[PDB]
CSV table of C-alpha atoms in Angstrom, one decimal:
chain,number,residue,atom,x,y,z
R,1,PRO,CA,-12.4,58.5,17.0
R,2,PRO,CA,-11.7,54.8,17.9
R,3,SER,CA,-10.1,52.8,15.1
R,4,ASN,CA,-12.6,49.9,15.4
R,5,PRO,CA,-16.2,50.4,14.3
R,6,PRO,CA,-18.7,50.8,17.1
R,7,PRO,CA,-20.9,48.0,18.1
R,8,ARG,CA,-24.1,47.1,16.4
R,9,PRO,CA,-27.3,48.7,17.9
R,10,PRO,CA,-29.0,47.0,20.9
R,11,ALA,CA,-32.5,47.1,22.5
W,1,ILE,CA,-22.3,77.5,22.8
W,2,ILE,CA,-25.6,75.5,22.9
W,3,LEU,CA,-25.0,71.7,22.6
W,4,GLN,CA,-27.5,69.1,21.6
W,5,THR,CA,-28.6,66.8,24.3
W,6,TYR,CA,-29.3,63.1,24.2
W,7,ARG,CA,-30.2,60.2,26.5
W,8,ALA,CA,-28.6,56.8,26.9
W,9,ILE,CA,-30.9,53.9,26.1
W,10,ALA,CA,-28.4,51.2,27.3
W,11,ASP,CA,-25.3,50.5,29.3
W,12,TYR,CA,-21.9,50.9,27.5
W,13,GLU,CA,-18.4,49.7,28.7
W,14,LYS,CA,-15.2,51.4,27.4
W,15,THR,CA,-13.1,49.1,25.1
W,16,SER,CA,-10.5,51.7,24.3
W,17,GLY,CA,-8.9,54.8,26.0
W,18,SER,CA,-10.7,57.4,23.9
W,19,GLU,CA,-14.2,55.9,24.7
W,20,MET,CA,-16.4,57.1,27.6
W,21,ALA,CA,-18.6,54.7,29.6
W,22,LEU,CA,-22.4,54.9,29.8
W,23,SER,CA,-25.2,53.8,32.1
W,24,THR,CA,-28.8,53.8,30.9
W,25,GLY,CA,-30.6,57.2,31.5
W,26,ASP,CA,-27.3,59.2,31.4
W,27,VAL,CA,-27.8,62.6,29.6
W,28,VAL,CA,-24.9,63.7,27.4
W,29,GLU,CA,-24.2,66.8,25.4
W,30,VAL,CA,-22.9,66.1,22.0
W,31,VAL,CA,-19.7,67.7,20.9
W,32,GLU,CA,-19.0,66.0,17.5
W,33,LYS,CA,-20.9,63.5,15.4
W,34,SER,CA,-18.8,61.2,13.2
W,35,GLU,CA,-20.3,59.3,10.3
W,36,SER,CA,-18.2,56.5,11.8
W,37,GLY,CA,-21.1,56.1,14.2
W,38,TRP,CA,-19.1,57.3,17.2
W,39,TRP,CA,-20.1,60.6,18.8
W,40,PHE,CA,-17.9,62.7,21.1
W,41,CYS,CA,-20.0,63.6,24.1
W,42,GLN,CA,-19.6,65.3,27.6
W,43,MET,CA,-21.1,64.6,31.0
W,44,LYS,CA,-20.3,65.7,34.5
W,45,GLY,CA,-16.7,64.5,35.1
W,46,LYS,CA,-16.5,62.5,31.8
W,47,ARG,CA,-16.0,63.0,28.2
W,48,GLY,CA,-15.4,60.5,25.4
W,49,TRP,CA,-16.5,58.7,22.2
W,50,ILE,CA,-19.8,57.0,22.5
W,51,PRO,CA,-21.7,54.8,20.1
W,52,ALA,CA,-24.6,56.9,18.6
W,53,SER,CA,-26.6,53.7,18.3
W,54,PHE,CA,-26.9,53.9,22.2
W,55,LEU,CA,-28.7,57.3,22.2
W,56,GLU,CA,-32.2,58.6,21.9
W,57,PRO,CA,-32.5,62.5,21.6
W,58,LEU,CA,-34.4,64.7,24.0
W,59,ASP,CA,-36.7,66.1,21.3
W,60,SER,CA,-39.1,63.6,19.7
W,61,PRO,CA,-37.6,60.3,21.1
W,62,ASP,CA,-39.1,57.6,18.7
W,63,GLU,CA,-38.8,59.6,15.3
W,64,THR,CA,-35.6,58.7,13.5
W,65,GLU,CA,-33.2,61.3,12.3
W,66,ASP,CA,-31.4,58.7,10.0
W,67,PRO,CA,-31.4,59.5,6.3
W,68,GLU,CA,-33.5,57.2,4.2
W,69,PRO,CA,-32.4,54.5,1.8
W,70,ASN,CA,-31.2,55.4,-1.7
W,71,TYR,CA,-31.8,52.1,-3.5
W,72,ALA,CA,-30.2,53.4,-6.6
W,73,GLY,CA,-27.0,53.3,-4.7
W,74,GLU,CA,-24.0,55.5,-4.6
W,75,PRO,CA,-20.4,54.6,-5.3
W,76,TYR,CA,-17.9,53.7,-2.5
W,77,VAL,CA,-14.7,51.8,-2.1
W,78,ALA,CA,-13.3,49.9,0.9
W,79,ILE,CA,-10.3,51.6,2.5
W,80,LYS,CA,-9.6,48.7,4.9
W,81,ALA,CA,-10.5,45.0,4.9
W,82,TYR,CA,-13.3,43.9,7.2
W,83,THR,CA,-14.5,40.4,7.8
W,84,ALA,CA,-18.3,40.0,8.5
W,85,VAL,CA,-19.0,39.1,12.0
W,86,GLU,CA,-22.8,38.9,12.1
W,87,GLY,CA,-24.7,37.2,9.3
W,88,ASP,CA,-26.2,40.4,7.9
W,89,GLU,CA,-22.7,42.0,7.5
W,90,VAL,CA,-20.6,41.9,4.3
W,91,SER,CA,-17.0,40.9,4.1
W,92,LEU,CA,-14.8,43.1,1.9
W,93,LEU,CA,-11.2,43.3,0.9
W,94,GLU,CA,-9.3,46.6,0.8
W,95,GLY,CA,-10.0,48.2,-2.5
W,96,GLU,CA,-13.4,46.7,-3.5
W,97,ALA,CA,-16.1,48.9,-5.0
W,98,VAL,CA,-19.5,48.9,-3.5
W,99,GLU,CA,-22.8,50.7,-3.7
W,100,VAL,CA,-24.0,52.4,-0.5
W,101,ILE,CA,-27.8,52.1,-0.3
W,102,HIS,CA,-28.5,53.5,3.2
W,103,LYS,CA,-26.2,55.8,5.3
W,104,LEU,CA,-27.5,54.9,8.7
W,105,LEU,CA,-26.1,57.2,11.5
W,106,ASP,CA,-25.1,54.3,13.7
W,107,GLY,CA,-22.0,53.6,11.5
W,108,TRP,CA,-23.3,50.3,10.0
W,109,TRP,CA,-24.3,51.2,6.5
W,110,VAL,CA,-26.4,49.0,4.1
W,111,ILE,CA,-24.4,48.2,1.0
W,112,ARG,CA,-24.7,46.1,-2.2
W,113,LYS,CA,-21.7,44.3,-3.7
W,114,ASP,CA,-22.9,42.5,-6.7
W,115,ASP,CA,-25.1,39.7,-5.3
W,116,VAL,CA,-24.5,40.2,-1.6
W,117,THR,CA,-26.3,42.9,0.2
W,118,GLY,CA,-25.8,43.9,3.9
W,119,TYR,CA,-24.2,45.9,6.6
W,120,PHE,CA,-20.7,47.3,6.6
W,121,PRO,CA,-18.8,49.8,8.7
W,122,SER,CA,-18.8,53.3,7.3
W,123,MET,CA,-15.5,54.1,8.8
W,124,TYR,CA,-14.0,51.5,6.4
W,125,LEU,CA,-15.6,53.1,3.3
W,126,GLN,CA,-14.8,56.1,1.1
W,127,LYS,CA,-16.4,57.9,-1.9
W,128,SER,CA,-15.2,57.9,-5.5
């Protein structure tokens, strides 16, 4: 997968 | 053979080549779920890594499928340094031991390091 974490949750 | 199906609850923009982009309402089939909090999913004409955070399922939409906290905590170590960005996040240095208290599917786990408790990326942690 991507090497950065995903973003925090939104909405 | 029979892929689970989920629904985008917000817009997402690709930041990297492996990612896929979303628009709210899109219905994806899920190929792989990574504890990282990134899921590999397919649409019509599109396939890429998507933040799981941005998905409801098409089953019981409001019921969570996250585990639940284990406040006793479980032993992990940081494999890669991360600096907190939000206030609720925890900065670590490569090699620090922590206690995982909640393995949220979104990739942002709750951890306790001595007297600081907060969120930290699961991708940057490992068991012991």
